[PDB]
Symmetry: D2
Subunit: 165 residues, 4 copies
Amino acid sequence: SMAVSPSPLRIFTAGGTIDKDARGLVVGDPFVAEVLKTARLAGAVSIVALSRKDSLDFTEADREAIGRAVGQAVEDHILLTHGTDTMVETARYLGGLPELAGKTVVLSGAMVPGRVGGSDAAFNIGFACAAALMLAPGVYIAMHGKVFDPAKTRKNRGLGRFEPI
Amino acid sequence: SPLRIFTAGGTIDKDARGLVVGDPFVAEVLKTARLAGAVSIVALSRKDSLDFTEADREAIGRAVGQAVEDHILLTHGTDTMVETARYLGGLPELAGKTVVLSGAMVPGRVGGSDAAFNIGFACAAALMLAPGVYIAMHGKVFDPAKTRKNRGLGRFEPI
Amino acid sequence: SMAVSPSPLRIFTAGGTIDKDARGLVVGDPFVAEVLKTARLAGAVSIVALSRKDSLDFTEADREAIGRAVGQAVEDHILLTHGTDTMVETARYLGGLPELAGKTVVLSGAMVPGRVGGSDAAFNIGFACAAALMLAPGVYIAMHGKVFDPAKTRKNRGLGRFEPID
Amino acid sequence: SPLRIFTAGGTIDKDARGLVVGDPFVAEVLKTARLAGAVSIVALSRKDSLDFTEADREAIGRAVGQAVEDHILLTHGTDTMVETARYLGGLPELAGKTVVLSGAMVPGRVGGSDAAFNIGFACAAALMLAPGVYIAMHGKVFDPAKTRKNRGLGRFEPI
């Protein structure tokens, strides 16, 4: 048969600074979809909205619903765009669900809204997409051009960066 | 792991300030990426890749061999990216390196460019893939020996 | 002599949505300076900072100070970038200063920060620069591709537009 | 006053597919300008202005004459903007209109372009200047009969 390009990555959007839209800022349409629109993909990426909340407003119940959506996807490569304030809490929660054992689940986002000049967003999305495809099964944070183990990571609010504990 | 980036020109770096090859766009993207790790950028060429000769490819291969880093990104034009990747794939000196070639179909300084996404994807690939030579474009990893540029499609494709 | 390009326009910056930047957004460096940097001007434009306040927070005293900077300029063509929330109050105040009688003074700004995609800012700066050069002496607001008389204008916060009192 | 905008191509409108002339950039700028007044945009040409003949200039003159509006902006390439402007300045049919020509030295779809600024400036000029034909570029108003394009300066300059 003629070659069929697969679509092995599914993306979930859960809000955050990456998606803030001043058109100060509040959470608008997912910025990840703008980046993939112009990525000239060989395949395609299904993109599904889970939430538009600021990550500091996430409850235990919000994390559980995200775990259930991730767990029910047919894809084994998952990228979750999210705010950076509670990305570590969501990542640690997902890491303790056995329903995710066979999946590579990467969380990412941006410190500068994608719709603001000089944003890290487009770089981070490309980096995180590749990380979701290439890393062994597990839950990871992809930021600053590297991979973080959620159990050994914290968000430094002052410096706007993830760092090792 | 420490990453070394080489720039050999191409559409990704075309500037209009038609277009012609300007300063490497990858340096603009990495500047706002807020990187944690060791990364350095080295300029090799501003040629349009259609003009690359066998001697240009051999010079690229020796330059990549000068890097002690084992994770390499080369930004390049798409017209002869496959020829450079296949040549590099046959150099025994590079056998322990992960070498990824990437670029852009639209200049990074033009609106709606794939460049920033491609640079992020390619940086991860150069850090995560096993030793070998790869093209990272269109959100996937190509094997150079089994890839061509399909000008009809506007994409790299498997042979 | 070899021709000398004049610099007949002076720009003052007083903050506003036009200048908001990520650090939500807050008032950063003047966006008007980024627009003029790439405008390939034949002349130049002297750009002076007066304030980084959100315009809601401007007092009687803030307006009086802006009136003094504008009045002491040598140039007779002046653009003031400003927040839109109290642009009408500033414009009305300047309109009552006899020291500005021979000057063309235009206020402008943006409803979307210049550093955000799909901003009105660069258009508004070009339109307002031309308005400051070409209108008769007076005080005006240049927004939405037109010229408003501050005495007959209000900001519609709800609608995001300047409009007449008709 | 109602403004009519004509697009005749030029660097301002060049897009990636080097660059070639694409959809009018003026329509992208006016879409986000939150305009209060009446403005309409009409496409005339996508030529590079070096290729315009005396017949092309005469066609542009009659198109401008078809507008009932008295305030006109024409976006154009800079290579023969002076030739078009001088030609229009000699048409008695246009004597009651304010006709402003503008464009950009960098395409509007390229980073660090003069285009958006030039469009705002030129729209104001078309609304505010006395009847006549003008070039609005570099934040000033040029008299076409006393203007040249100085490729050495990269600016229009007075004679």
